């Protein structure tokens, strides 16, 4: 379930086999140094050996740092956890800042336990359940068939109850899990003898299964370390996995879970797949959060943390002194910083074209040139937002292409930051000032 979002146009970092960034691949344009560094961090995550590294992405706004993070996440793909949080999310009311950071850190480490299960699959021939009225004894047998074999099973009480609940019939192809006991109705083999109700609701036939009736299959259970901690914190922690309200889990629970998971890894029962934690706008975090991050990165069960910042020198929250990146020197000492630069005219043009392709907006050459000039003049994101409005204006005109006049109308209707600032300065009396004064009347 997704819609066309800001970073929906990038499917990866777009790198070669030697980590050399392509000029334009997988949705990303330019940022060759940044993309190479992101690929190095990608390989570091995929190796799974280096623990608790911190990496910072710095640069001016609209330089693609969040795009770089989304590219890293897409290259990681599924099965490798990626926890995207903002600096504002830590400050909660039910949990402490340190507890929220601990939970965010543990959300990025995945534990995989693989199990082998026996599955019975086939098309039912005959089902027969005999139960005595006003009596608890039930006796039943079923005949489940496959293309090459057919057999009869005499059923216990629980299997009889499960099949009665599932409403299994003759023309049903079902699967039975001998361990769990769940019955899944895969489909139908033929019609239901033309009774009145439910006349033609079974037309979507499914083919009869083929092969051994009882076959073994493997099932992988992937659960993050934080989920295990929440489950083992209290008896009602399982509800807390969905409701929230996990509380502040006692440190002994986390230590014991760490020891148990290490034992599982040494035993081969579980596979640990560390991931990446991504903090948007880390400058919103307090100095206490930065100290905890400093210490918690030294743990052996820690993920790789990547942060985005554009503040330059700024006051660290919780302190009264300015810091090089809005972060204390202690955190800067243990983090590798990857930088981003402003975009050329050509890079802006090709990013606009990529966005137009993703938004399914067909731009004429002159319209694209005008949009590129506007983006260089005002902002990349401004032109990106203008594309869709221009498409809507063109649709209002009953035209299937965006021309220069549609972009001109969109430019006239919707303003940039600079034009709004100019209009405010020219008409300052019509707006409420910081001193709380405004003129409402026009005379």
């Amino acid at each position: 379930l997704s819609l066309i979002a800001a970073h929906s146009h990038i499917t990866g970092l777009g790198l070669d086999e030697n980590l050399q960034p392509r000029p334009t691949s997988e949705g990303m344009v330019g940022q060759l140094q940044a993309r190479r560094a992101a690929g190095v961090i990608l390989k570091m995550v995929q190796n799974g050996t280096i623990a608790g590294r911190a990496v910072l992405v710095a640069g001016p706004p609209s330089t693609g740092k969040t795009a770089l993070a989304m590219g890293v996440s897409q290259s990681l793909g599924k099965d490798v956890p990626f926890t995207a949080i903002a600096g504002s999310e830590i400050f909660s009311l039910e949990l402490s800042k340190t507890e929220a950071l601990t939970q965010a850190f543990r959300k990025s480490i995945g534990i995989k336990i693989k199990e082998e299960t026996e599955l019975i699959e086939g098309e039912v021939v005959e089902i027969q359940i005999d139960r005595s009225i006003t009596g608890g004894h039930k006796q039943g047998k079923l005949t489940i068939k496959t293309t090459d074999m057919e057999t009869i099973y005499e059923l216990g009480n629980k299997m009889i109850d499960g099949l009665t609940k599932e409403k299994v019939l003759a023309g049903d192809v079902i699967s039975i899990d001998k361990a769990s006991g769940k019955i899944t109705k895969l489909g139908r083999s033929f019609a239901r003898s033309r009774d009145y109700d439910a006349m033609g609701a079974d037309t979507r036939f499914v083919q009869c299964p083929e092969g051994e009736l009882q076959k073994r299959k493997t099932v992988v259970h992937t659960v993050s370390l934080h989920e295990i901690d929440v489950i083992n914190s209290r008896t009602q922690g399982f509800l807390a996995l969905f409701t929230g309200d996990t509380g502040e889990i006692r440190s002994e629970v986390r230590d014991q879970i760490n020891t148990k998971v290490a034992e599982w890894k040494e035993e081969g029962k579980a596979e640990i797949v560390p991931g990446v934690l991504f903090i948007d706008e880390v400058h919103m975090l307090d100095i206490e959060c930065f100290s905890f991050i400093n210490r918690a990165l030294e743990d052996e069960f820690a993920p790789i943390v990547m942060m985005a910042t554009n503040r330059g020198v700024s006051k660290t929250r919780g302190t009264n002194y300015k810091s090089p990146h809005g972060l204390p020197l202690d955190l800067l000492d243990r983090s590798i910083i990857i930088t981003t630069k402003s975009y050329n005219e050509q890079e802006i043009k090709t990013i606009l074209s990529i966005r137009a392709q993703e938004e399914e907006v067909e731009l004429s050459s002159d319209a694209l040139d005008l949009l590129t000039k506007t983006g260089v003049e005002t902002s990349l994101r401004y032109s990106s937002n203008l594309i869709s409005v221009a498409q809507q204006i063109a649709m209002k005109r009953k035209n299937n292409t965006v021309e220069v006049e549609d972009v001109k109308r969109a430019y006239l209707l919707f303003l940039d930051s600079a034009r709004s600032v100019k209009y405010v300065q020219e008409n300052e009396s019509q707006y409420i000032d910081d001193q709380g004064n405004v003129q409402i009347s026009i005379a």
């Binding site: 021939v125 005959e126 027969q128 005999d130 005595s132 003759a170 023309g171």
Partner: protein, 50 residues
Amino acid sequence: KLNILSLDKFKEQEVWKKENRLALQKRQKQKFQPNETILQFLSTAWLMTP
């Protein structure tokens, strides 16, 4: 003569023992409610002709 008598007696005893073991197993397999009414639900594939 006496040994033949004893041998046929032993053969009959052995046959009786084995048959009784089989009958006991069958009686064990037939464990259900005695002489009670039973409600049965059956589903089966039915062949059809015009």
